[PDB]
């Protein structure tokens, strides 16, 4: 019963952490899934920004 | 009456498979009646009709020990046409039956009681027909057997198929 | 700052201009206008709880903005619209994200298409309750992905498809998913770990075969016994196939009695178990 | 004695119980970490390249002011 | 069934041992993968603050332009304790690697936003003094 | 809507104007038009599942974008048109990689250019099986890797460039890439853990040597007794280096067979061991 | 003749998979002739016809025991060919075969007469193809068997497959 309960909960402390890592770990799949809606919906109003600033380039220079 | 087409089924629950009667629907027959399944020109058997919310319309069930008997398989063509006892010759008084145990499973040999075996046997298998070399399963004490009509004797005349009754003795 | 007058002014403003007050030139200035008066009661909406009201609000701003010429944050307010929708008391947050995916696709925007695509089909079950076209939406998108290179999200709408697929009798069509999810996985040593799980479901999945569908695809897998990851996958199954092969409805659930020992069985394994356990029972009384 | 032998038995048991459930939990991990490692190799490259895209509207708007 | 149960419980330790030791392998490309995660961010944020300015820029431009067994046992058992000092080696590190990316990943979506916004509206003062 | 149609419009505008078409200015500004015209058709037909006819449509989109003066937004292209490809039944999927690269790298962009480089490599061996280029590409890859300090990527790649290095036979220059992947894994303790496998592997692999090249690498290693980790790599080796010094295939083989237990052999193991088995009988038989 | 594609299936009825012959349909092959099935360009095995009203044409059934040896699975694809033997050198004259129970779960001690085998063998078994490590099952008296052939001679030459006929020696 020594070592028995010496290892017993040894590891029954370590089920904690990856409790604490499964979910931190998942919480940032998310929050990076909502700067790829962001990101990219950013760049694509710059398609028109390079094409609008490009037109004022053909007006004042 | 003068005929019909009919698919073979599976039988729908366990309790109609014990009953050893060919479960069908509503919107056809009724349960009570009696049919005789025709195969081929010498191949007629006679099975008991019990309705059931589970059947499709244009369509008979029958269980294991049916289909290995009358030797139907799932999914063949068949014609049924309804069939009436005459009770003045087909009424079953005496019928031999070989009991075994259908699995060799189980293995527990009681002094399985007779008399309670034939009182169970009419109070489930009463007003049906059975026919000489039959297959079918008995349900006694939460046990299954595996019966086999050898003789029937009406109420002495030797019949091919009766009719059995509440006043019917089984050996 | 009220959303009922915003809605006016929005409405007042969003009608194609012409005569006196035209004058020369359109404005597409205006529909834009009305845009953010709509957006800007929307937010309201939901800062109250409304839902029901934003939701609707910000589908009138996301049409609007279609009017003028701006396809791109006009998808994001469908988007708006179907999260408002989703956590409101309504339905139309699957009408919102249809016409948020049309444009997203007609766009040439894919992977966020199919990061839609995937919440869709994810709606069209946990709520709708319509897994015959939820398995359609999941399916295609794992295509989008899958032509992405993005093979981890492939494999995780693949998952769905046929995780569900199992529980809507489609026992075959899952084994399929299972062995393509499973040939696409091996390459990279980085599944090779959870690469059991994947055979272990497929051979349990039976589509009613009269065989060894499972004894055949159980020795293709490549066990190792000082493998102990490998103990909770296949060890189990030659084990079921012996108590199939036997119609013996008590080894098999003596074994899985036991396996639930070594390996908890999740509620997709139990379901899938009893099915089989029923295919033996069935096989003894039929 | 069994009464011994047969406590040491329900302790280590029940210890290897709570270790293959924890053990779960380090697999689905390595599963999760790497889903995210390809969706940020998206996310990345989109927002470099957004960068590069910009950095060249910045360049043109600048020499459009002078 | 004595033997039966210091040896059963004994195998799955040895199955155990491997266990956290193919888990630790795992969990360092974790180590590997997250520590790579965090590097191909700090140029994201990098150019994250870089179309921050040039929108500055831009916008202010177009204003300028609109006007022996248990001794074992226990050996096995330790490495699996042992390996505590790995799975400690992670979780803490990344862990804490993890909030200081989102806190700057929020940082990034903002302004990821922000600039959308005035090119929108840098396009629509633009249109209308246009060629 | 029909990319025929476009495919063709595309081809009529990408042409330097000349006379009334010229006017004044042009150039870029008509180019660019048939590029993002090829670009529409390419992505319908990626649509319609044509993917090889989407992929020469970007080919086409990009190289006509060359013809810009934007390699950026080409090599992009490039690597769309890679994606199509790959995913698709012909070929040139390698073709337009390469043409990335070549863009990628005179640019300057070496992250990026070694981040599709392994991808390359990594398709040149699992499809092409053409190890040769393969292994120069594992390796340039990393050395641009070295370069942005991304020690991590680096090294991944010197694993590649090794591991299929032993099967090419290049047992020497194996075990040196492992010596090099060593002394620069060491000074992170983020790696100590794994630096173990690496004076296995060095150590198993044998340039036809007679001596002790591997007693000694055996030697060099660091390790104390009471190691959980160093238990999977050198205590086997001196029982292997023992069982050659003594020309017995038969502990070897043996003790293949019972370490197999306490640590899986992989593939590569197998294979180079084999490797072993066989010197030792042919110093037998000889 | 020249080979065609078909679907493996299971074997109909339970008294034809004791007889270790690939049931096919009678609109396709007749019962008697040989056929060699293809599953890859390393696996080439040969099976006997007998053909069955239940099975339906463009696919092959195959017992339980016969997959469990040729690796075959109802569902795939597989190529069967004509077979013709060459009785000149191919007839079996003296057949070794291994027989165990195969169910090791009916296992008895009774005494059973090989004579009586030897002569149902080749009464069921007669102008069929049988091969080196074939494995297959005897019914005998209801009881089933595991037959393993072991060696194969010729009316003295060694072969793989070959026809046993009428005055065929079985041990």
Request: charged share 30%; hydrophobic share 40%; proline share 1%.
């Amino acid at each position: 019963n020594r070592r028995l309960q010496q290892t017993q909960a040894q590891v029954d402390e370590v089920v904690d952490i990856m409790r604490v890592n499964v979910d931190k770990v998942l919480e940032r799949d998310q929050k990076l899934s909502e700067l790829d809606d962001r990101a990219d919906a950013l760049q694509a109003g710059a398609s028109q920004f390079e094409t609008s600033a490009a037109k004022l380039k053909r007006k004042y220079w | 009456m003068a005929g019909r087409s009919m698919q073979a089924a599976r039988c729908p629950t366990d309790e109609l498979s014990l009953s050893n009667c060919a479960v069908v629907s509503e919107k056809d027959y009724q349960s009570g009646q009696h049919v005789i399944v025709r195969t081929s020109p010498n191949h007629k058997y006679i099975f008991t009709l019990r309705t059931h919310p589970s059947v499709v319309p244009g369509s008979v069930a029958f269980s294991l020990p049916q289909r290995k008997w009358a030797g139907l398989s799932i999914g063949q063509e068949i014609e049924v046409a309804l069939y009436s006892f005459d009770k003045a010759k087909q009424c079953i008084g005496t019928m031999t039956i070989e009991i075994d145990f259908l699995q060799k499973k189980n293995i527990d040999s009681n002094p399985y009681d007779t008399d309670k075996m034939a009182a169970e046997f009419i109070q489930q298998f009463n007003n049906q027909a059975f026919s000489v070399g039959q297959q079918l399963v008995f349900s006694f004490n939460d046990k299954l057997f595996g019966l086999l009509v050898k003789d029937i004797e009406a109420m002495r005349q030797k019949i091919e198929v009766g009719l059995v009754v509440g006043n019917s003795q089984v050996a | 700052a009220e959303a009922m007058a915003l809605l006016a002014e929005a409405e007042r403003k969003v009608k194609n201009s012409q005569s006196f007050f035209s004058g020369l030139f359109g404005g597409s200035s205006k529909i834009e206008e009305a845009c953010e008066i709509y957006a800007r009661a929307a937010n309201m909406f939901k800062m109250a709880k409304n839902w029901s009201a934003a939701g609707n609000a910000f589908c009138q701003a996301a049409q609007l903005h279609l009017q003028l010429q701006s396809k791109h944050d006009a998808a994001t307010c469908f988007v708006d619209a179907g999260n408002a929708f989703k956590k409101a008391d309504p339905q139309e947050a699957i009408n919102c994200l249809m016409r948020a995916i049309e444009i997203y696709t007609d766009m040439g925007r894919f992977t966020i298409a199919a990061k839609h695509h995937i919440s869709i089909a994810e709606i069209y079950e946990t709520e709708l309750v319509d897994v015959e076209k939820a398995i359609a939406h999941y399916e295609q998108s794992a295509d989008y992905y899958k032509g992405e290179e993005s093979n981890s999200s492939a494999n995780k709408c693949l998952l769905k498809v046929a995780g569900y697929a199992a529980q809507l009798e489609q026992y075959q069509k899952a084994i399929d998913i299972y062995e393509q999810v499973g040939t696409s996985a091996m390459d990279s040593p980085l599944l090779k770990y959870s690469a059991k799980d994947y055979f272990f479901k497929a051979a349990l999945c039976h589509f009613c075969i009269d065989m060894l569908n499972a004894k055949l695809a159980v020795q293709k897998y490549e066990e190792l016994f000082p493998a102990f990851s490998d103990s909770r996958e296949c060890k189990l199954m030659k084990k079921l196939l012996e108590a199939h092969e036997e119609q013996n409805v008590d080894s098999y659930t003596e074994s899985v009695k036991e396996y639930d020992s070594i390996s908890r069985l999740d509620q997709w394994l139990t379901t899938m178990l009893l099915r089989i356990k029923k295919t033996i029972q069935g096989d003894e009384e039929d | 004695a069994l009464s011994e032998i047969e406590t040491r038995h329900s302790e280590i048991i029940k210890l290897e119980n709570s270790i293959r459930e924890l053990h779960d939990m380090f697999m689905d991990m390595a599963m999760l970490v790497e889903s995210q490692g390809e969706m940020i190799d998206r996310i990345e490259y989109n927002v470099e390249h957004a960068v590069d895209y910009v950095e060249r509207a910045v360049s043109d708007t600048k020499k459009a002011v002078k | 069934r004595a033997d039966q149960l210091a040896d059963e419980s004994l195998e799955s330790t040895r199955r155990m041992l491997q266990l956290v030791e193919e888990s630790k392998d795992a969990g360092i490309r974790t180590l590997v993968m997250l520590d790579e995660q965090g590097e191909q961010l700090d140029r994201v944020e990098e150019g994250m603050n870089h179309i921050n300015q040039d929108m500055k820029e831009a916008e202010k431009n177009l204003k300028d332009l609109g006007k022996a067994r248990e001794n074992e046992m226990d050996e096995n058992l330790e490495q699996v304790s042992g390996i505590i000092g790995n799975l400690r080696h992670m979780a803490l590190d990344m862990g804490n690697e993890i909030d200081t990316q989102n806190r700057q990943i929020d940082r990034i979506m903002e302004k990821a936003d922000s600039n959308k916004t005035r090119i929108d509206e840098a396009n629509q003062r633009a249109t209308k003094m246009l060629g």
